[PDB]
Amino acid sequence: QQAGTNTAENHPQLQSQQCTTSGGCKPLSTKVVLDSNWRWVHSTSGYTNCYTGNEWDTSLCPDGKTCAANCALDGADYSGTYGITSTGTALTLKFVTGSNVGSRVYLMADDTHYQLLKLLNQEFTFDVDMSNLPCGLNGALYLSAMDADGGMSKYPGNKAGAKYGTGYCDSQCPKDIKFINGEANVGNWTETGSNTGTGSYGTCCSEMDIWEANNDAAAFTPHPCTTTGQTRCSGDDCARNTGLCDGDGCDFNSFRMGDKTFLGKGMTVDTSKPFTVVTQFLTNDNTSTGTLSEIRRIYIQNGKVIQNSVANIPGVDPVNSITDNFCAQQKTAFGDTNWFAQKGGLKQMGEALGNGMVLALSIWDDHAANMLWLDSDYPTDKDPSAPGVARGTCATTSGVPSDVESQVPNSQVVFSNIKFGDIGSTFSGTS
C-alpha cells in the first residue's frame, strides 16, 4: 500500500517506562498507531475508495500488486472516527464509534518504527480499568512478531510501513488482513460481515497474549509458530493449529483452571476497579540467552500484592505459572491437543520474545466464537462440567456481535502505566 496525504497522521502519545534494577524507571516518549485494516484506502491520485464496506474496487484492484500500486492508506481521526484517546499515559479504547467497531493500535518508538520489546528475562507491567468492559468484549494487550517497520524493507509494494500500522500478523494466521507482503489480499475475496472479508492469503507469526480479558474473566496465553517472523500463508499452512501456528495456545485463565472466585467483580482481583498486572518471562539460567522456562503473573490492587491463583484440576499439578509441564498437563486434562508443544512450546515462544516483538492494544468483539472461549462455556457442544469447558460466568448466549454492538456500544477499556524491564524492577514492595 502507498502512503496517503489527504489526512495528516498524528500518532497519539502514550508514554511508557523502561526500568532497571540499579537505576529504576525512566520515561520513553512512545506513541500509538492505528492498525492498517481500520484505515481509509483510496486511489493515490485522489479521493476514490479502493475499498468500501466489504468489497474492493476491481477497477483499481484487479490483482494484489496493481491494487497496492494504486491505493494509499491515509491518516486517522483517532478520537472522532475510532474512539481512541490518550492522556499521554493512559489509553482509552471505546467499543463503538458511529459505524466503527473496535480498534487495534501498536506501540511506537517514533513515527516510523514500532517499539521492539525484547522481554526474555524481563517483565512487562501495566494498569487496566475494565469497569466498563462487560461480557462478550475483549480488551487485549499482547505481543506479535511483527517487523519494526511494518514490512517496508522486505516488501517493495509497501510504502506505508509502521507509520500507517501495516504488517500485522498473529498466531491465527488471519486472512481478513487487507494488505500482506505489500500486496492487497484481494484473491478470492469473500465477504464475512458488513465491513469485513477474507482473501486467499493469511499472515502468521508467534504471539504472546499478555492480557485478554473483560470484567468477567481473563487469560494469558503464549502461541508459538514454527516460523520466524511475519509469514504470509496460503492453503493448509494457514490452517488453525495444524498449519504454521498454534492457534489455541497454552492458556492460563484462573476460572478455567479451577478457581472461580479469584478474579471478577468484587473478587480478590476486583475487576470493578483498576489494577496492575505484572507478567514476568523467566529463563532457565536467568539470562537473556536462556530458554524461556516460566511465565509468572503478579497482580497489585489497592497496594496489595496478589500472587496468581493456583490450578485446581485433577491431573494438573497445583501451580500458578505457565511452564511446559503445566501445558502438557492441562492439555491432557482438558482433552485438547498440545499444538503448543508441537510448535516448540515455551522454547519457541522464547526465541520469538528474544528476537523482539511489537505491542498491540485492542478492543474487539468476536464474530467466530462470541468470546465464549474467554468468559463462558466452550466449546458449545461439550459438557460444561468436564474439566476445562467453563471459563467464566457469562451466559452461553452472550457476546454475539450484533447484540453487544447495539446493547453496550459505549463499553471501553483503559490501559495505563505501561512499564517494562528487569525482573522485579517495574514495581516494588515494602513492610
Ligand X SMILES: OC[C@H]1O[C@@H](O[C@H]2[C@H](O)[C@@H](O)[C@H](O)O[C@@H]2CO)[C@H](O)[C@@H](O)[C@H]1O
Ligand Y SMILES: *[C@@H]1O[C@H](CO)[C@@H](O)[C@H](O)[C@H]1NC(C)=O
Nearer to ligand Y, 286 or 397 (CB): 286
The residue type of 417 is N
Residue 383 grid cell: 459438557
The whole-angstrom separation of Cα 14 and Cα 339 is 36
Q: Using CB atoms within 10 A of its CB, is residue 26 exposed (0-12), middle (13-18) or buried (19+)?
A: exposed
Length of the chain: 431
Interacting partner of 286 out of ligand X, ligand Y, none (Cβ under 5 to 8 A depending on kind): ligand Y
Closest CA to 129 of 18, 225, 232, 273: 273
Cell numbers linked to 428: 516494588
Asked if 37 and 82 count as a contact pair (C-beta separation under 8 A), the reply is no
Among ligand X, ligand Y, none, what does residue 259 contact (CB within 5–8 Å per kind)?
Answer: none
Calculate the CA 152 to chain-centre distance.
Answer: 22
317 binds, among ligand X, ligand Y, none (CB under 5 to 8 A by kind): none
Which among 9, 123, 183, 207 is annotated as catalytic?
A: 207
Q: Does 280 bind ligand X (CB under 6 A)?
A: no
- Choose the one of ligand Y, ligand X, none that binds residue 285, judging by a C-beta under 5 to 8 angstroms depending on kind: ligand Y
- The answer to whether 373 contacts ligand X (rule: CB under 6 A) is yes
Should residue 224 be labelled a site residue for ligand X when binding is judged by CB under 6 A?
no
Residues that bind ligand Y (CB under 6 A): 285-286
Cα–Cα distance measured from residue 310 to residue 293, given in angstroms and rounded to the nearest whole number: 18
Q: Which residue is nearest to ligand Y (CB)?
A: 286
Q: How many CB atoms lie within 10 A of CB 380?
A: 13
Q: Quick check: bond before 224 cis, omega within 30? A: no
Contact residue for ligand X among 188, 242, 318, 369 (CB under 6 A): 369
Query: Which partner from the list ligand Y, ligand X, none does 251 bind, CB cut-off 5 to 8 Å by kind?
Result: ligand X
Interface of this chain with ligand X, residues 244 to 263, rule: CB under 6 A: 247-249, 251
Among 81, 103, 221, 279, binds ligand X (CB under 6 A): 221
Give the DSSP H or E segment for 393.
none
Identify which of residues 79 and 321 has a Cβ nearer to ligand Y in the complex.
321
Q: Report in angstroms how near the CB of residue 340 gets to ligand Y at its nearest.
A: 23
Q: How far is the CB of 224 from ligand X (least distance, A)?
A: 13
Numbers of helices and strands, H then E, in the chain: 7, 32
Query: Minimum distance between the CB of residue 353 and ligand Y, rounded to whole angstroms?
Result: 17
Assess whether 207 carries a catalytic annotation: yes
Can you give the binding site for ligand X, defined by CB under 6 A? 172, 221, 247-249, 251, 336, 368-369, 373, 379
User: Which active-site residues does the annotation give?
Assistant: 207, 212
